[PDB]
């Protein structure tokens, strides 16, 4: 069993367990604290509640008191204010020892219903404001934590220790055995047929910048015709998304520490927005404020959209070629499933396998890595990646990420209010399918030969019967 | 012979023709008085060059014969002060220069008013806007794609801001499909396939586009590097991956089938195309970009040929359209002359029924002037011809397509695209 | 011999070595096609000069000697049409040249990798994050500064955002009296002390920091005048100090005390260090500056003296630490060589105690010929002038520090103050735990 | 008894005071309007309270009682729009109230001339301008500094825009000392040192600046999360620290020596001051901040209290000044009263002679209100709780106050270190001029 995130999970009087959230914070070494601070906020606030309870059965006791003098015909009195020493205090009147001694009976029938209104106008109103600060500074607090980690996590702040789960595939060796040949890299291969111009794409279009030409550009459709048909016969609808979102629905489905380094502005009609780093953040806000039943899940969907990175941080990382660029087309796997019976968890699973199927299918070796949960965003409970062999990679360098599978569980559905069926949230998942061209980056080195690049067998029909890209220099 | 704008066609003891000009600013309906700015500050210009001569010649004299401080003023305070006029008065003639627009090829209608566009010619068998027999009359593009289930403008608009929205389904594998044959159909023609950056820094974008374009037209990227602009189209990226290069006849012509999504804000035409994704901000385009040789009219020939094969495109989709002349008041300043392909629309409003799907542009030397794409003689050198033409705007070209290919149950995939589309040979209606 | 890059290095026929050139791009694992496309540029230029001196010839030929007007027109086509090329094609030539990053130091571990980090040497005694005798573990230093009750990070990002954080109390004394003595440290060192301004000019800056630092490091200031940047280190405004300067041998070196408060945006470093005031948006830094001779490997001796000065710094405070030599492949455009002094944390995270406090780098001339702070005030060599060289190297930024000084100096009760530190506290020795 | 502005205040027959109100408006120079203004929203929002209160009876007579749906009709239609209608104008009626300056002190000059600020009391012996015996004339700071080698404005202004400096050696050494006694002499009177973030995000610097320092005064700084500002004092901060925090009496007073760099646009001065570093965008700023209880005139008392530390401060620099009685006109919003201390520049130009150094203001309640730092942690009188006080006074702006030690400390072959300083300054008793 694996937790949702939610408030009753720190009430250890409601049948939670707060001491599951202190152990996944330690898991992502994060703030253990804010667990007995949100407590101690929880606790604030049903006191507040309590006092405001206290407050509002001040009016009973008036009206009671008022009632029955009228029935006994007791005169009013003269319109006179309420003195100075109750209005300094009212608490002091509804003890049950004051009310015996007659705290009431010092006032007429006319400052009760003064007092009464006084209350309800400086005290009820007071302390009902006072509950909504404190819920809200709770939930400040509560949507700080990130989602729980999942049992099968590798525990620790370095992804040196990221698990190797499994290999698969021949990866060909960086020298051939038999005749010396060092494999090139992506980028000298690229060139080398003529299809790669980094500096006309700088030039044009700033730092990483890149035209693709001839071949390779019908290899990156190919790649996006076969990863949606592939997709699509798995049951996975087919969607295509606006590449802009406005700012108040990219803050609903991504962390805010991306708005720096990752997502660029767009201006100039309507609202600011930012440019979409991965088709995941507009299918998420697809499902803004909807409702699924049992019978209406799961819902398969094969995202398709150019990305847009800033890659603020990696300014010096990956500076070669295109596998590292702020401009790229992905085809990318998005389930919205039922929270009940570990589906969410069955449907992780399968939509990794269907990754492996995937590169399997294109002869491309890879190995699947546990991250480790120092490495989990907020959002996700766990995470796989699929690393790719890169023969021509420098050392140490030759299996790199080119898939990222995710269980996000309940923590997005929460935040865009999309219910199962107090209310229930459905879970979501994200996996890459292929994001193309650090894909074709990894195609080009395991399929090369000394005079060019050999085309995937299960890609040619998709690039009308092409099975080899000759070297032009 | 058409001519090219350049400071010598408005010297006419040069052998110029400045009226040429003023025919050409006539027919664009546009400020005829350029024409004669631009020759007298070329008068003030070349007076301004014989002064200084003049000047210079006074050191001559001097040289022959306490004697010297006079010749060091004269290069201090007059010559210095001349060269540095002359310059000023060049900048200033090449600034009202730069503002006149290409030379109007002849062919080009000259009107004011696009009412008045020339129909060229009417290709294929438009289906009726309702079925004689049956009485069924066609949908609109946007009502088709719904009851397809393939069109979320609601999640569109709400994620994505005005006119946003999802494609699903049988109808994204369709635009895959058109993309797909587009460059397939392309590069058996000799059109080289070319990716391009989605962004152009601003320094870029000046060089291949209009002033009023980043008003109206171009949305601004900020947060890495140099702010920058979305493209409109693959063209702009194209054009300027030749900055600054130089090409022999032997290299020509270069065709290339750009490829890219293309940004646009469409701030003209509020309230206008409202309804589906006939005019959105974000679209894909597979566009003919050519660069020819400026002699002995090859880009009028490279003209002819590239609408050719935005024709036979369409032909081979079998979708009807006509092929208009674009009059002379509705060219941009770098066109010489501009061909539209619009297709027939059976589900359009009355009298709305044939649209805009493909544009195709000879802007000879207007735009290699300016990122110097030169030809093969000193400051005298000559610049390449560049073209452009719509191969297939793809959110458009669906929309034309369900509308042509509709019956009551659903649409028929277009014959060509349906090895494209692993084989589906029919969208059902789903609503 | 350390060699500087300039262009005549990339001309082999003409006394330079340009695979020296390559070799250092190999070595930062950057783009070593730059070098062969200055090569080209270089000799298009130089050909393009001789297309030009030869049309020139035409002048004196024809000149000497009513074909008079066939002069002017070569001259108004050719010649001008010849310079205008010249001028572009150099101008190309050094936007490339300027893409290449400074040649790395022979004695720079080559690596892509920090793991490979090569370890110089340990000085210290550190003291075991489990007590030997107890079983006492010792805490984090956020933990620490929280029950001292000096440290407010709740009210601190309320009020400045993320990372924010107040300071209180004996806390704050200890925050100042690092940098007090700091920089009384280096005046007896001869290290003139400095202040700075805390705002740059995008001109200026643009001299002394690397592109990628607009976005991941300096924030934008605006309201008054044009735009500026605020500074992340004293360096920056330091060297723009010396713009366009020139000095003769007998003025060098010239040894700075920087200190200011510094601003990074650590947009890179998002979820990184997130507890406390290790990794922060501001912090005060007491900075060496040093301008050396471009001669006899001066910038080299003083490189050693200053990460020297360093260390003793830490020593007379009882910090353990490491010296660490940057591998090739994380060294930034401008250095040709970085040691780090990484100090012993016991209370951090198994695998993570010996974090950086220190980085001094030798920038050699890559930024003095950016800032044109040349070597001699005689031009007797035209425009081949050489260039002064500029260190820098951290003695203490004090927030970091203060985090080092409590987990080293804890106790179950509170926080000894270290003994060269108590004069600059009124005497305090040992700061109590209030909770 | 000095009041409180508050909505009771404005309502004459229940037992407030209006004409108060308005005689303060007139004494600041502003809207009096803005009084009656108030008075007729208040009315307003009170008879709408009573037309929902009476239309709410209309369910206890009919609902007690196929007329049912009328209940709801009634419900729908008129209870949830005259309940709207309620916070709407209680709403307008707060927001005409936020535009009301705080209650002017009865001891404060009334004028809208600064000329007639009072002249309060004299203190020291402020040195001729003019030798008496040799004739020699004090020179101005600027060009003292100059003199000493200490200041760069050349290649500050060209590193940091208009008014940038940097400042070299000795002086830098004085303006440390400065800061570092400040600090002392505070904690001895029982401030405790605080150290702030020099950013604070716009819904914060909202609640501690009125909007005029928007434009005038504060710069923004982007790049990271949402825009911010740099402060312009560490008042603003450490104002803001006390966000939704309650007091008790027990608690109070709450004594801060607030320490930061103070960053200002000083748009509004454009040709004032531009000599030196007098006025400046950038400095440092010893500043005591005071939290009080809102009995018993206690902030009065502090107020006394707080100049009373500034002068003792500037008595201690052997440093000659006046206390001076901010005119009514001249007051911010938010504050009761002002007392600047004006210390003798001895170079200043003819009349011109004393500048201010210090000011001192009591805000009484003004932004406690809008940062909800309530009085007592009981809730008995709900929302007609009170809030504490505050107050703040400059200890020493040490650029400005540099300046004045250099003009009144000169000789003509230097600058003598005044005495208390000069342990601060390693025993440094005299700085000698370079030129
Ligand atoms: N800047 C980039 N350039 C190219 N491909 C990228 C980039 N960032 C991510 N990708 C690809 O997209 C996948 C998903 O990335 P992420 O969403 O960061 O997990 C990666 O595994 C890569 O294959
Ligand atoms: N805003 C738009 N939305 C969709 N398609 C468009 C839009 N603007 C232009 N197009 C398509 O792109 C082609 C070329 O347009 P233009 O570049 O304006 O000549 C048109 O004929 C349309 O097919
Ligand atoms: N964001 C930061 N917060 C706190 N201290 C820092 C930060 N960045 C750098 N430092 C300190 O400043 C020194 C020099 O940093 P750098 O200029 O990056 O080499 C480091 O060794 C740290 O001690
Ligand atoms: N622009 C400035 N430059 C230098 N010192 C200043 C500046 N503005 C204010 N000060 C100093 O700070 C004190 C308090 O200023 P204020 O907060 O305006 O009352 C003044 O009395 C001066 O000593």
Request: charge should be negative; glycine fraction near 8%; proline fraction near 3%.
């Amino acid at each position: 069993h694996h937790h949702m995130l939610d408030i009753n999970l720190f009430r250890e009087y409601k049948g939670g367990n707060p001491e599951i959230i202190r152990e996944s914070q330690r898991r992502r070494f994060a703030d253990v604290t804010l667990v007995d601070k949100v407590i101690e906020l929880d606790e604030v606030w049903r006191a507040t509640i309590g006092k405001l309870n206290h407050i509002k059965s001040f009016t009973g006791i008036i009206s009671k008191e008022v009632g029955n003098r009228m029935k006994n015909k007791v005169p009013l009195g003269d319109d006179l204010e309420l003195p100075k020493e109750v209005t300094d205090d009212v608490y002091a009147l509804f003890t049950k020892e004051a009310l015996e001694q007659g705290s009431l009976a010092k006032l007429n029938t006319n400052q009760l219903k003064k007092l009464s209104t006084y209350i309800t106008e400086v005290h009820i109103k007071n302390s009902e404001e006072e509950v909504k600060q404190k819920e809200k500074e709770r939930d400040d607090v509560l949507l700080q934590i990130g989602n729980i980690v999942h049992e099968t996590v590798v525990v620790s702040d370095n992804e040196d220790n990221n698990g190797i789960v499994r290999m698969v595939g021949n990866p060909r060796p960086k020298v051939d055995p038999e005749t010396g040949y060092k494999c090139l890299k992506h980028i000298d291969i690229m060139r080398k047929l003529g299809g790669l111009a980094t500096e006309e794409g700088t030039q044009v279009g700033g730092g990483r910048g890149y035209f693709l030409l001839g071949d390779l550009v019908r290899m990156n459709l190919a790649l996006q015709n076969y990863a949606i048909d592939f997709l699509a016969k798995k049951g996975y609808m087919p969607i295509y998304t606006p590449f802009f979102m406005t700012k108040e629905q990219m803050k609903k489905v991504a962390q805010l520490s991306q708005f720096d380094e990752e997502l660029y502005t767009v201006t100039g009609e309507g609202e600011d927005k930012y440019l979409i780093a991965t088709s995941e953040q507009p299918i998420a806000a697809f499902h803004l404020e909807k409702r699924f039943d049992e019978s209406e899940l799961p819902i398969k969907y094969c995202g398709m959209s150019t990305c847009f990175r800033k890659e603020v941080g990696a300014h010096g990382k990956d500076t070669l070629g295109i596998f590292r660029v702020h401009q790229f087309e992905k085809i990318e796997q998005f389930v919205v499933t039922s929270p009940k019976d570990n589906k969410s968890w069955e449907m992780f699973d399968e939509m990794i396998g269907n990754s492996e199927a995937f590169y399997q299918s294109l002869g491309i070796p890879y190995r699947v890595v546990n991250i480790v949960s120092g490495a989990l965003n907020n959002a996700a409970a766990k995470k796989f990646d699929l690393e790719a062999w890169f023969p021509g990679a420098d050392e140490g360098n030759e299996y790199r990420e080119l898939v990222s599978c995710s269980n996000c569980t309940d923590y997005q559905t929460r935040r865009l209010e999309v219910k199962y069926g107090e209310v229930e949230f459905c879970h979501m998942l994200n996996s890459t399918l292929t994001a193309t061209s650090r894909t074709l980056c990894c195609i080009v080195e395991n399929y090369q030969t000394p005079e060019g690049v050999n085309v995937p067998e299960v890609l040619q029909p998709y690039m009308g019967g092409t099975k080899f890209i000759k070297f032009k220099n």
